[PDB]
Amino acid sequence: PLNFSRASEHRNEKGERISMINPRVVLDENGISHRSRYFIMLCDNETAIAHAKKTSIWAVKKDSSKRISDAYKKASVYFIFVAQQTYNALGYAQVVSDLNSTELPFWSDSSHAGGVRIKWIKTCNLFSAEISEIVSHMDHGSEARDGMEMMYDEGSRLCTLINYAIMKRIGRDR
RNA sequence: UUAAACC
Numbered sequence: 001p002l003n004f005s006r007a008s009e010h011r012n013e014k015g016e017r018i019s020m021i022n023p024r025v026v027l028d029e030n031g032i033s034h035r036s037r038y039f040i041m042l043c044d045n046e047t048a049i050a051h052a053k054k055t056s057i058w059a060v061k062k063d064s065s066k067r068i069s070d071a072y073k074k075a076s077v078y079f080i081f082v083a084q085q086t087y088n089a090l091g092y093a094q095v096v097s098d099l100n101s102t103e104l105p106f107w108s109d110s111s112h113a114g115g116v117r118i119k120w121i122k123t124c125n126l127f128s129a130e131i132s133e134i135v136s137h138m139d140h141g142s143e144a145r146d147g148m149e150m151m152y153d154e155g156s157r158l159c160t161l162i163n164y165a166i167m168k169r170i171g172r173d174r
Numbered sequence: 175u176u177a178a179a180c181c
Contacts, residue, residue, distance in 0.1 A: 024180045036179055076178065092177075121177050159177050166175055174175070 002157055020153050031151035037071045038155025042084040042146040048107045049090055056118050057105045064147025065113035069099045080158050087135050089126040089162050093118035122162050126171025131161050
């Protein structure tokens, strides 16, 4: 079972922090991998998520746009989509363009900085108690804030849990 | 709906 209480204590022989799931993955002092970075999208709008599952365009919020665009410079960047009120996992996707003002989804509003293209990896409408728990403690033990970056081990565990449910025919949406 | 990466 994953426990972050001692995550800072997982270290290699050089003193670098390493992942609790895969000890070969070197992390910064925030638990983030320079190679693979994960952001949560807390979805409150059925129209937006259904349109994004069809068209693969997402609107990024002003408050998280700079950090996401900076992460896209040298890492693979993933968005994990979670329904805000129920914490159902809706899927996860890789960001395959940077922020731009040329291609916006029609549902974007003044909260959004611009658009990105995504490539869906899995889609679902899934309840999992461990996904719920990870989202509920993502901000230092308190609930995730929309657009926040999470730790490598949180992103990787969420992808594993989504994949596992889909392969068991649980929470599929297609 | 075969995560990616690392091995």
